[PDB]
């Protein structure tokens, strides 16, 4: 790896610089290098990792949706035949997206998840595993589509089980996991009732636990609670 010769601390420092400069591809490459040092990640470091790859894949997904939409239009009756280019370029972006997802899933499997013993780390990584299988599922059309969806579901479910046992209902990781698993249900698993039920129950259980929190924890938890409410408003 091209980051093999750089100090772990230097990679973390540069990931932060890359974040300030909105250089998310660089940020991701630095964090990959850091993970590949083989030491566990701290809370801050886990966040750096997730921020970097979320921004990179988020851009790829946005582009994929633009291209897939143009491609769909081209296959409507009355559309002039324009050749293979739209499919080719959608495929190019798709392949790049899949590569990023496989990279992240690779880091999680080798060996972030297996070394993660504390709830905050294990739930966070299992959420990411669910998230990156979900992105693979968004573009899947083949023999393995069902297995990709189940891989997402399984990772989210394991994360859910741990989060309910080991974290308070207001914990931002628990909230974020629930938000994304709810989206999984709505957009990937064709289960809008499960999505709505999950978002509602998570919101209400968190509401009931806000009284235990500091002002700063309250701000963190309520921010994610609002995203649950936003989705519920979108869906009802």
């Amino acid at each position: 790896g091209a980051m093999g010769s750089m100090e772990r601390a230097s990679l973390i420092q540069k990931a932060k610089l890359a974040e300030q400069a909105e250089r998310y591809e660089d940020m991701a490459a630095f964090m990959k290098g850091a993970v590949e040092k083989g030491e566990e990640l701290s809370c801050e470091e886990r966040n750096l990792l997730s921020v970097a790859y979320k921004n990179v894949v988020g851009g790829q997904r946005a582009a994929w949706r633009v291209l897939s939409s143009i491609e769909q239009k081209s296959n409507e009756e009355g559309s002039e035949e324009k050749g293979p280019e739209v499919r080719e370029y959608r495929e190019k972006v798709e392949t790049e997206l899949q590569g990023v997802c496989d990279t992240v899933l690779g880091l999680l499997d080798s060996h972030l998840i297996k070394e993660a013993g504390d709830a905050e780390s294990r739930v966070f990584y299992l959420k990411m595993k669910g998230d990156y299988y979900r992105y693979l599922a968004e573009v899947a059309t083949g023999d393995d589509k069902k297995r990709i969806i189940d891989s997402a579901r399984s990772a989210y479910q394991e994360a859910m089980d741990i989060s309910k046992k080991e974290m308070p209902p207001t914990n931002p990781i628990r909230l974020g996991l629930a938000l994304n698993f709810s989206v999984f249900h709505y957009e990937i698993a064709n289960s809008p009732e499960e999505a709505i039920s999950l978002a509602k129950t998570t919101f209400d259980e968190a509401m009931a636990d806000l009284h235990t929190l500091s002002e700063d924890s309250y701000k963190d938890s309520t921010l994610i609670m609002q995203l649950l409410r936003d989705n519920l408003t979108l869906w009802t």
Binding site: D131, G176, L179, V183, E187, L227, D230, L234
Partner: peptide
């Protein structure tokens, strides 16, 4: 699209 984090 819906919100995720």
């Amino acid at each position: 699209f819906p919100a995720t984090v």
